[PDB]
Amino acid sequence: KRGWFDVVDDWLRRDRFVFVGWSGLLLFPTAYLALGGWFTGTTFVTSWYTHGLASSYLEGCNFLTAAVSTPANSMGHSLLFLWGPEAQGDFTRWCQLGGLWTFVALHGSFSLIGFMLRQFEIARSVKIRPYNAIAFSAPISVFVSVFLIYPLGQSGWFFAPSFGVAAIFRFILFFQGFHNWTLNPFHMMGVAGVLGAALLCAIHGATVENTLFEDGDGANTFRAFNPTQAEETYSMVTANRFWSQIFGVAFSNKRWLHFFMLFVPVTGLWMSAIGVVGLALNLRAYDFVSQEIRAAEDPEFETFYTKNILLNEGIRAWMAAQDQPHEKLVFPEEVLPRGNAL
Amino acid sequence: ESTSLWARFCEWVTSTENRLYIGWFGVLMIPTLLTATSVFIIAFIAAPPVDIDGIREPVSGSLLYGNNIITGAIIPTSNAIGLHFYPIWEAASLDEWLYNGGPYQLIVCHFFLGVCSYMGREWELSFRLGMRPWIAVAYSAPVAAATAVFIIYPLGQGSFSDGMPLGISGTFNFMIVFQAEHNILMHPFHMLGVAGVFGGSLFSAMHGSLVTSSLIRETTENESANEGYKFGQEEETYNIVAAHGYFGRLIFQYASFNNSRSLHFFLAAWPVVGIWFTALGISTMAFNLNGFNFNQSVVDSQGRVINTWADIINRANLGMEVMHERNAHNFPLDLA
Amino acid sequence: AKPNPNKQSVELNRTSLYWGLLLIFVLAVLFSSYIFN
């Protein structure tokens, strides 16, 4: 190794406690900056001038109610650089205008890119297959569709999720009230995928741990294993028979088992991402026209779908005034939908 | 050689040669589950409207009464009945029985008994096959969750009408009304359950990808590796050392699992504990112990209120609270 | 000219057939409910 590229590759791809690699140059700075931006925004920066709230520990918020807030709706889809035509180089006023959210999001996306690249590079250095790198595509797609594509199809960054706990809860409730997101088949596939992945994880762990082999004399079975051993540590035949007699069907292929384990959550997350991409343009599966027409013609027809519609209407009407200060909605108390005595 | 009638019956019931194991817990499981399944199918297809709120306002939930799969459900029992036992023989007629919400109670009771017997039968077959009996302990988490949403919440709220409907849109309605009344999203136990499911998906994908990435070459490129694995083989089919090396260079050495038994125990333990805690949270919220209430917490020097994301969530809850039952309330407080 | 040296034969076992049928019918359930409107 004599060339500049060769010596740089020798140093970068070294055996170390923390592997740097060629992708480290993109991953470490951006990830560090994103983490620091989130911590700084949650600790010191406020949200009074862009949202009308308080979103910092300095103002009296706990871990749940502290967040990094989105810019105002007047800023549209501006990238809000520190040197842009809005902040104009002023750091304090850049923080006050909501520029830390775009900072964190833009650095986090490149950190995700760098992390997948790091997975690829480490897999190639160890001479294995890049299925772990393939599996990260689902989280990356979820992040891209939720934090970038959805706001890019709306009025501005104001309707993006804010980096916080209660902010994400408000985002979820808004998605329920306005989009009827629970009634979306793509979200249903995503929910099925997540719950099935949890089911698979629990059932595989229990089945492996309860079909072990007697390789020791102690009740603590964790010490009867050696990673370099040849024989398998549990009885696949016994597991298959148990699950065939209990459930009806069972796995007989370890490779197929583990590929299914990989396949389920990735597909669920990708389907949910497609659903959110569709929802970015207000293409929401909101209503059933036949049910609406039947309920309109017949004042006796009622199902749970109509009750959900009424709940969404109430959510919209009562959250609109404060959630969207730019619309300047002043609602007299007698126009808000309300039930009897409640 | 068995001779007595009871001895032969016991040998048949506890037989490991049956296509599906019966056992002594299956004796209880099979008829209750079959009863609940039959009643569920018949009610989901052709049941009349059910007065759920007890205000003489029937709600349709059947396919034959203008519904689809997404909209159809089984309406919970009437609010007038409450927690009273309402068997089929306590009604004047089947027309009255179907009007008040009997099938929901029937299915709920039979389903509870059936799932308890299912967990018992899991233990039973584990014992008969010579295994270790904790797959049944794993199943206790979904069993507890189902019990909490179908039994404990009506027990604490005083009526089966506050129970979860046996449908999709009914489930969404249950979730929305639960949020409006208990602020479930702010409950630490619900946060732990969400962490449990998210971590379960994370670790399932992680384990599947790591195992699929270390398969030893036993085939060609025109066939799948599943054909490279042979059922009942003795040798391991993937490189645990290679997978551990990859993961330990991905994060750092002492973060990966070098023990397959320990890794699989962690995989089993994470989602089970998460679901245990979320079911405990639902059961706790049944007795009206809601989540964190950070409403009007931030106050400035002169005493005025500075709003927060918690206050926006509160506005949404107020929106979905005044509309969850329009005509079922005569007094300002929903104390039930 | 000479027979193509890139000849391969496809296959599908009963487990794959069952999985495909189940996927088709579940998708049909969900999206038929949503398409009939």
Binding site: - | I69, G232 | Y18, L21, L22, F25
Partner: peptide
């Protein structure tokens, strides 16, 4: 008209489940 389609879809799914359980390819130990 659509109720028939819904019932047919559900019945077909249940029949597929039954056939998958009771007419599976039996595992064989090598």
């Amino acid at each position: 008209m659509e109720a028939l389609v819904y019932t047919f879809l559900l019945v077909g799914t249940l029949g597929i489940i039954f056939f998958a359980i009771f007419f599976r390819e039996p595992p064989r130990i090598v």
